[PDB]
Amino acid sequence: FAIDPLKHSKLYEEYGLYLRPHAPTIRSIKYASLIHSMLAEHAARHNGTLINPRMYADMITLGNTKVTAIVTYKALTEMSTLIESFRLPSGLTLIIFDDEKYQSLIPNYINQLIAYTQPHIIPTWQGIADFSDTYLRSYFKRPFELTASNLAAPQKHNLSPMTRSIFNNTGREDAVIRKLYGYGEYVFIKYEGCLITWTGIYGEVTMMVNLSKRDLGLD
Amino acid sequence: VQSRTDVFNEQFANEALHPMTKVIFNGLDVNTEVQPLSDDFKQISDPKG
């Protein structure tokens, strides 16, 4: 990812995207966050901009350019022992997902790699970040909607607390649904606004407000 | 009952594409006029011998 989800996990918690508990992708998400501690140091060394980002971006993205006078090519040499350390058959890949909160929080050293990467872009529907894509679906917690039709058991729909999280769409209270229906140990995503689908003169119109369902009336 | 082209925000965008010129005119569209080829005769009313 652009921002690693184990040192900076709360931002993905704001989107409804909780980190899967600890395997070939559980091991790979620790491998990617190890690069960010290496990368961040390098763009300290010379403020900010890590130097030769082209041979940088042809290492993370592409299983490519093993390198071994020197001090110029020092940070490349320290890194080619770091990414050939863990055995991957291809690169790691980027994952900006197209959000002015998420795009603003990308650090400087990741953005300099974006010119030379062909990164993977995940299109936000309105926000939430919407859960396809072997990156976003094998790394952490493909969720489960919990509208007024799918009641009321975790054994019924064959969910598991290590794979699926639950999106409250009842209109009931939050605390009871993980009390009597058996959704304890099942962690719940927190959304603090709401989306309204109005009728219209022309058709269905979907607007959103950043107030919760309790803060205003109208239901 | 309008959907949705009667609102000027969508009507103004659908007139930059294929701009309408021709209107229904159930007559003859006069665009030019012709003068007589020779002003040859005077047109007095009560002649004098």
Side-chain angles (χ1 to χ4, degrees):
Chain A
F1 292 96
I3 298 102
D4 56 351
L6 58 89
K7 293 183 185 293
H8 194 275
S9 178
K10 190 177 285 294
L11 181 64
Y12 294 101
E13 292 180 353
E14 294 293 327
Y15 292 162
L17 275 73
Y18 289 176
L19 184 63
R20 182 177 292 174
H22 294 173
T25 59
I26 292 96
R27 189 177 64 246
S28 175
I29 193 170
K30 187 183 288 185
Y31 288 159
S33 177
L34 185 62
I35 300 171
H36 290 173
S37 296
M38 184 64 71
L39 251 170
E41 252 209 309
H42 285 233
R45 299 201 141 308
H46 188 149
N47 59 255
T49 165
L50 29 38
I51 177 181
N52 192 0
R54 173 205 236 58
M55 195 177 287
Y56 287 163
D58 290 333
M59 288 171 72
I60 303 103
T61 305
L62 304 173
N64 187 350
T65 60
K66 297 188 289 185
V67 64
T68 299
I70 55 172
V71 274
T72 88
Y73 291 165
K74 187 269 302 297
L76 278 305
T77 303
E78 185 178 0
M79 190 179 173
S80 67
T81 62
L82 191 276
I83 196 156
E84 295 291 329
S85 70
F86 58 95
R87 298 292 184 183
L88 285 182
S90 69
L92 313 194
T93 320
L94 306 184
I95 311 167
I96 306 109
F97 57 108
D98 196 1
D99 193 0
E100 294 180 354
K101 188 180 182 181
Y102 182 78
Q103 189 178 0
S104 66
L105 292 174
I106 299 174
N108 299 113
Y109 62 93
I110 297 297
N111 291 115
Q112 294 178 356
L113 296 176
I114 303 310
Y116 292 155
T117 297
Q118 185 66 41
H120 188 194
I121 307 164
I122 309 302
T124 56
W125 180 59
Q126 296 295 119
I128 35 48
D130 283 345
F131 325 107
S132 210
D133 285 334
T134 59
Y135 294 99
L136 272 75
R137 171 189 269 175
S138 298
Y139 289 166
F140 57 101
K141 287 188 186 291
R142 181 178 67 247
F144 180 74
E145 294 181 353
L146 201 271
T147 185
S149 68
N150 49 358
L151 276 306
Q155 295 296 110
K156 168 160 195 194
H157 290 303
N158 201 37
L159 306 199
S160 67
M162 293 181 184
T163 303
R164 295 180 67 89
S165 66
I166 285 92
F167 176 71
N168 204 165
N169 198 2
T170 55
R172 301 290 181 91
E173 294 177 353
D174 195 2
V176 297
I177 305 299
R178 64 181 179 179
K179 183 257 181 66
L180 76 155
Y181 290 166
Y183 290 163
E185 189 183 357
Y186 291 92
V187 64
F188 277 55
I189 41 63
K190 291 292 225 51
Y191 282 168
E192 66 272 17
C194 68
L195 188 147
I196 311 296
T197 302
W198 293 93
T199 62
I201 304 297
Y202 295 152
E204 293 183 83
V205 176
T206 62
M207 70 179 284
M208 64 181 70
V209 298
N210 54 0
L211 296 173
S212 67
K213 191 179 178 181
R214 187 176 174 86
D215 289 330
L216 77 162
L218 50 91
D219 59 348
Chain B
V1 177
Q2 63 274 17
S3 66
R4 291 184 293 113
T5 182
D6 287 331
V7 181
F8 190 78
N9 296 115
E10 291 291 328
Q11 184 178 3
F12 186 76
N14 288 319
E15 291 294 327
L17 298 174
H18 55 87
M20 60 89 207
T21 61
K22 183 69 176 177
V23 300
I24 290 293
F25 187 71
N26 286 317
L28 184 65
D29 186 73
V30 168
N31 55 5
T32 59
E33 290 184 355
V34 189
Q35 66 183 359
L37 293 180
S38 65
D39 193 1
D40 184 74
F41 298 107
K42 295 172 95 289
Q43 287 183 355
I44 51 96
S45 296
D46 292 332
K48 293 184 285 185

